[PDB]
Amino acid sequence: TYHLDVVSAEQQMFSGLVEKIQVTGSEGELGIYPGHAPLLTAIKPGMIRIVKQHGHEEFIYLSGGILEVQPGNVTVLADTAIRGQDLDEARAMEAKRKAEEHISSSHGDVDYAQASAELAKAIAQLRVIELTKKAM
Amino acid sequence: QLDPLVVGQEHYDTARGVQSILQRYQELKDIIAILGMDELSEEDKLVVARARKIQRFLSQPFFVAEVFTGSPGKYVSLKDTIRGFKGIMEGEYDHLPEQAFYMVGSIEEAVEKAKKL
Amino acid sequence: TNVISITDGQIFLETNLFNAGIRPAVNPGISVSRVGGAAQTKIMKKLSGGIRTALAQYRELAAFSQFASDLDDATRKQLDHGQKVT
Amino acid sequence: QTGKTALAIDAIINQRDSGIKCIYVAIGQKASTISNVVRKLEEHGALANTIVVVATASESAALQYLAPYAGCAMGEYFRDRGEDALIIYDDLSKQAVAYRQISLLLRRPPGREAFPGDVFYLHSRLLERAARVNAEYVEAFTKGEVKGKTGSLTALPIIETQAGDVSAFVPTNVISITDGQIFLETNLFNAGIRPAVNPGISVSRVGGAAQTKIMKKLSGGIRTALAQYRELAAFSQFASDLDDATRKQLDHGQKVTELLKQKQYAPMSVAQQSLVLFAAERGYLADVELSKIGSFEAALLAYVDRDHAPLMQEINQTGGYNDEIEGKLKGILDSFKATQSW
Amino acid sequence: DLDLAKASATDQLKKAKAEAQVIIEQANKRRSQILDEAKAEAEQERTKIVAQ
Amino acid sequence: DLDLAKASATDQLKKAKAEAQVIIEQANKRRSQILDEAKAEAEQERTKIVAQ
Amino acid sequence: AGAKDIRSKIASVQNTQKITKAMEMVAASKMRKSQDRMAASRPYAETMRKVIGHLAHGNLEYKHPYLEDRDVKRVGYLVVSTDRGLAGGLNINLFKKLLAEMKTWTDKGVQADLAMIGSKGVSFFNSVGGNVVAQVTGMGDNPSLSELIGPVKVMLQAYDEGRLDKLYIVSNKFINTMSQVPTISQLLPLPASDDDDLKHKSWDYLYEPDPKALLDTLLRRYVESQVYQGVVENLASEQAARMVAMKAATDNGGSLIKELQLVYNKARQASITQELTEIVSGAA
Ligand SMILES: Nc1ncnc2c1ncn2[C@@H]1O[C@H](COP(=O)(O)OP(=O)(O)OP(=O)(O)O)[C@@H](O)[C@H]1O
Ligand SMILES: [Mg+2]
C-alpha cells in the first residue's frame, strides 16, 4: 500500500491508505501501483478509482487537476471547477465588464443585514450628547 | 370582542392572518432595504406582495371625504370584507397590480379596476 | 397645550433644522394643516401630493442615511430624492 | 387589559370545592364588568361560595375608598374563626385615586404625586390583615370554642401600571408591602400567550413551602428554564445557523412556553397540571415538535381521565410523590404515546 | 425487503393514526353541532315561557 | 439469512397490523365518550337555562 | 430634558447594547468556523510549492517568465476587502498602506492597476479615482475559488501579455484572535524558497507529457491558491475585528446608560418638587 491524498484548493477529499489507483491522465489512462516511479501529469475531468487496502473500491469524481506521485506517496491536486481556455476567458470577461461598469452584487449575510438595520434604527435620532453634558 | 366565540372562527382567523402578514412584512422591510429585493426567498417575495396588497385594500373612499377628493364613496359589507381579505391572503388575486386595490370598495371593484387599468 | 388645542393647524419651527441651514425651518409631517387642499389652487393641490409622499418615504428611510453606501440602490434613489426635495 | 381580572376570578372559581371561602371586592369597576363577573360566578357554580362587594365607577369616592376594608372585615370574620378565606381587591390603584380625591377635598397636604402623605399607610394597614394566625390566637379569640384550627386570609391585590413602569409610586409601594408579584406582560398577552405571566421578574417569596410535594418536584426547573429560553430566543433573531446544542434548549423552551397557556374559564386540578408537567419535563414532548400540542394536552387529559382515575384521586387527595408514582406516570405516558393520537 | 417492511410498518402506523384523527375531529364537530341545537331549543323555550 | 428476513418481516407486519387495529378501536372509544358526554351536557345546560 | 423623554432614550440605548452583544456572539462563532476553513487550505499550496520548487530551482532549472525579474514599468495589485461594515478600522488601514506604497511607486513614474475583491474597496477606490480594471463582489461568508478565477486570470493575462510587472496581493494577516495586520506581499515574480531541494537529487519525476507546458499550469494554479488563501485569511480577520469592535460598542453603551440614568434621576427629582411646591404655594 501507499499513502494517497486528494486535495483541492478549498478542502481535502481523501486521505486513506490505498493499494492501487486508476486515472485518465491527459495522455491516456494510467494505473498507479505501489513503488511506482516518480511521475507528474495532468488528469482530465472524470472519475478516479480508489481501492483501499482490504480491497474496498470507491469512485471519486474530479473536475481535473494534476497528479504527482513519489516513492511511497501520491497526491492529486484536484481542481474545484472545470478549467479551460474558453471558460476561464468568459469568467475574466465578466470580471472585466463588472469593473468597466460600476455594477455590484449583494452579500448573502441576512443576519448582518438584520442586525445592521436594527442598530441603525435604534441609534438614530437619539439626542444623547447634548442631553448628557459630555464634551468630548 | 375579537375572539372566536363572538365573531366566529372565520372572522377571527381572517383578522389574525392579516395581522400576521403585516407583521412579517414589517420584518422583511429592512432586509429589503439593505440587501435589495432580488435576494428574498421566493415565498418571502410572495409575502411581500400579499402584504403590500392587503395594505392597499383596507383603505377606502368615504362618502364625506368626496369634497376632499371628488371620487365617490363606497360602503362595504362585512361579508365582502372577509371575502376580500381571505381571498388576497390565499393568492386568488396574485395576478392583479397593487394599485388595483388602492381606494376601492368591494373586491369586485379591485378586479374591475385591474381590468380597466 | 391650550393654543395647540384651539387652532386649525400648526407650523413647527425647529432649531436643529435652522442650524443645519434649512430655512425656513418648518418641520413637515410633525406639522399639520386641517384645511389642506381646500385652501390651495388646483395646480398646487395637484403638485403637492407627490412632495408629501416623497418626504414621507424620506422620513421612513432617514434612519439609514448615516449607514448609506451599505444600502440597496432602489432605496438609495428614494433617499437621495428626499434630500433634493428638502 | 392583560388578564388580571380573568386570573383573579379564575382563582376564585377554582375554590368551588376547597375549604376556602372567596371574596371579590371591585373598586371603580364599570357596572357591566360586575354583571359579567356575577353571571360567570353563578354559571360555573362558584357564586354560592363567595361574597361580592361592589363600589362601581360612578359611586361616590367615599364608597370606593372604604370598600376593601369592608371586604377585609368580611374575610377576617372567617380568619378569626379558624377557617380559610381568599380575598381579591380589584384595582387598589383606584382605591388610591379615590382616597386622593377625598383627601384633596379636605385640603390635606399632598405628597409625591399629589397622593396624600399616608398613602402607604393606606395599603399597608389593609394588606397586613391578610395573615395566617396560629391556633392559640383563634382559640383565645373564639373563647375556647375552636381548638385545633389555624385561621388564614389570603389577599390578591391587583395593580395597574402604565407602560409597565413598575417603578411608579403606588406600584413600588405595594411591591414593598406584598410577598411577591405575578407580573403580567402586555407584549406576551398580545402575542396570544395567555396567561401572560412573565418569568424572572415574577416571584413568590413564600415559595415552595406553600407548594404540594409533587408540584414542587416537577416544577423546580421550569422558571429558570423559561427565563433563559426567553433571553436565548431574543439572541436567536440575530443569529441564524446557530449551534445545535442551544438549538434544543431553544425548542424545549418554545414547547414549554406553548404548553403553559390555556383557555380562560378552565381551571385545572393538581393532578391534571402535574401529569402534563411530567410529560413536558421528561422529554415525552420532544417528538411532538410540530406545534400541534394543545390537542396533545387535551387528549392526554381525556385518556388519563378515562382509564387511571384511581391515580388522579390519589394525587388530588394526597399531593404526594414517590418512585412508585414516578413509575406509574412513566407507564401512563408510554401507554399514551404508543396507542393514541392528538 | 426487510427495510421495505420497516417502511411499511411505519407508514401503516402513521396512516392508521391519521385515519383515527378524522374520526375524532368528526366527533368534536358533531358535538359542536348538537350543543348549538340544544342551546337554541333552550333559548326559544325561555322566550315562550317568559312571554307566558 | 433470507429465512431470518422472512421471519422478521412477517413478525413486524403482524405487530403493525395489531397496532393499527388498537389505535382505531381506541379512536372509536374516544368517539363514543365524546358523543355521550355531549348528549349529557345538552341536557345539563338546557335544564340550567330553563331554571334560570 | 423631561423624565419620560430621557427614559425613552435609556430604553433605546439598552436595546442598542443588546443588539451589539448579539453581533459580538455571532462574529465570535463565525471567526472559529472561518479560521478552521483557513487551515483546511494549507496542504494544496504547500504540496504544490514543493513541486514548483523542484521544477523551478532544482536540477535542469527551467525558464519561465513568472520566475524571473524583468524590468518594472507598471505594477498591479489584487486588493481583498470586506463586504460588510462594522469591522472597525480593518479596511481603511489597509487602503492607506496600499495608497502609500502605490504613491511611492508613482514617484518613480510607474503606472499602477487594481483588481478588487469585496465591495468596500470597490466603493473606496472609485471615490479616490484608482484604476480598477477587474472586480468580484458579494462573496460573503462563502468565498469560492471558481469566482476568484476571473480577476486573477485578468492579472495573469496582463502579466504574461507583457503589460504588468511585479504584481502584488494586499490583505490582512490573521495572527491572533485580537491582532490582525495589513500586509502587502509579492506573488509573482515567484518569491525565493527558503529551502533547497538539492536532496531531491536522487530522484526525478517521469514527466508525462512534457515539463514546460506542465510548469506553466503549476504556476498558474499556485498563484490562485495563494490568492484564495489571502481571501480566506482576510475573512477570518474581518470576523475577529467585528468581534472586538462590537465588544467596545457594548461597553460604550453601558457607560451611556450610567450618564443618562443620572440625568433622569435629576429630572424626576426636579419634577416632583416643582409640582408639589406649586400645589402647596397655591393653597393661599
Ligand atoms: N387565558 C385567556 N385566554 C383567552 N383570553 C383571555 C384570557 N384571559 C383574558 N382573556 C381576554 O382578555 C380580555 C381582557 O381580560 P381582563 O379584563 O381580565 O384583563 P384586565 O387587565 O382585567 O382588563 P382591565 O384591567 O383593562 O379592565 C378579556 O376580554 C378576556 O376575554
Ligand atoms: Mg380588569
mmCIF file with all atom_site columns, N, CA and C and ligand atoms in Angstrom, chain D residues 1 3-6 29 33 90-91 158, ligand 2:
data_model
loop_
_atom_site.group_PDB
_atom_site.id
_atom_site.type_symbol
_atom_site.label_atom_id
_atom_site.label_alt_id
_atom_site.label_comp_id
_atom_site.label_asym_id
_atom_site.label_entity_id
_atom_site.label_seq_id
_atom_site.pdbx_PDB_ins_code
_atom_site.Cartn_x
_atom_site.Cartn_y
_atom_site.Cartn_z
_atom_site.occupancy
_atom_site.B_iso_or_equiv
_atom_site.pdbx_formal_charge
_atom_site.auth_seq_id
_atom_site.auth_comp_id
_atom_site.auth_asym_id
_atom_site.auth_atom_id
_atom_site.pdbx_PDB_model_num
ATOM   1  N  N  . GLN D 1 1   ? -55.597 45.734 30.518 1.00 0.00 ? 1   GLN D N  1
ATOM   2  C  CA . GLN D 1 1   ? -56.078 44.707 29.601 1.00 0.00 ? 1   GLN D CA 1
ATOM   3  C  C  . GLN D 1 1   ? -55.000 43.660 29.319 1.00 0.00 ? 1   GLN D C  1
ATOM   4  N  N  . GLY D 1 3   ? -55.383 40.524 31.410 1.00 0.00 ? 3   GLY D N  1
ATOM   5  C  CA . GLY D 1 3   ? -55.908 39.337 32.054 1.00 0.00 ? 3   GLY D CA 1
ATOM   6  C  C  . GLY D 1 3   ? -55.797 39.313 33.560 1.00 0.00 ? 3   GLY D C  1
ATOM   7  N  N  . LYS D 1 4   ? -55.768 40.474 34.213 1.00 0.00 ? 4   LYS D N  1
ATOM   8  C  CA . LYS D 1 4   ? -55.676 40.496 35.668 1.00 0.00 ? 4   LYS D CA 1
ATOM   9  C  C  . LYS D 1 4   ? -56.981 40.040 36.307 1.00 0.00 ? 4   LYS D C  1
ATOM   10 N  N  . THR D 1 5   ? -58.103 40.620 35.878 1.00 0.00 ? 5   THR D N  1
ATOM   11 C  CA . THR D 1 5   ? -59.394 40.227 36.430 1.00 0.00 ? 5   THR D CA 1
ATOM   12 C  C  . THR D 1 5   ? -59.714 38.782 36.080 1.00 0.00 ? 5   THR D C  1
ATOM   13 N  N  . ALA D 1 6   ? -59.358 38.350 34.871 1.00 0.00 ? 6   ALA D N  1
ATOM   14 C  CA . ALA D 1 6   ? -59.576 36.958 34.500 1.00 0.00 ? 6   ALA D CA 1
ATOM   15 C  C  . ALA D 1 6   ? -58.816 36.022 35.424 1.00 0.00 ? 6   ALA D C  1
ATOM   16 N  N  . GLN D 1 29  ? -64.969 49.566 39.260 1.00 0.00 ? 29  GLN D N  1
ATOM   17 C  CA . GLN D 1 29  ? -65.324 48.805 38.072 1.00 0.00 ? 29  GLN D CA 1
ATOM   18 C  C  . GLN D 1 29  ? -66.617 49.330 37.463 1.00 0.00 ? 29  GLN D C  1
ATOM   19 N  N  . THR D 1 33  ? -68.972 45.127 33.865 1.00 0.00 ? 33  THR D N  1
ATOM   20 C  CA . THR D 1 33  ? -67.980 44.139 34.264 1.00 0.00 ? 33  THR D CA 1
ATOM   21 C  C  . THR D 1 33  ? -68.463 43.353 35.472 1.00 0.00 ? 33  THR D C  1
ATOM   22 N  N  . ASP D 1 90  ? -59.838 44.372 43.585 1.00 0.00 ? 90  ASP D N  1
ATOM   23 C  CA . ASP D 1 90  ? -59.752 44.695 42.172 1.00 0.00 ? 90  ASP D CA 1
ATOM   24 C  C  . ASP D 1 90  ? -59.460 46.178 42.040 1.00 0.00 ? 90  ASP D C  1
ATOM   25 N  N  . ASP D 1 91  ? -58.253 46.483 41.559 1.00 0.00 ? 91  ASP D N  1
ATOM   26 C  CA . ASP D 1 91  ? -57.745 47.838 41.403 1.00 0.00 ? 91  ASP D CA 1
ATOM   27 C  C  . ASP D 1 91  ? -57.612 48.594 42.717 1.00 0.00 ? 91  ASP D C  1
ATOM   28 N  N  . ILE D 1 158 ? -54.674 43.725 43.089 1.00 0.00 ? 158 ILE D N  1
ATOM   29 C  CA . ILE D 1 158 ? -54.390 43.964 41.680 1.00 0.00 ? 158 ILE D CA 1
ATOM   30 C  C  . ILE D 1 158 ? -53.909 45.397 41.510 1.00 0.00 ? 158 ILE D C  1
HETATM 31 MG MG . MG  H 2 .   ? -59.775 44.381 34.600 1.00 0.00 ? 2   MG  H MG 1
#
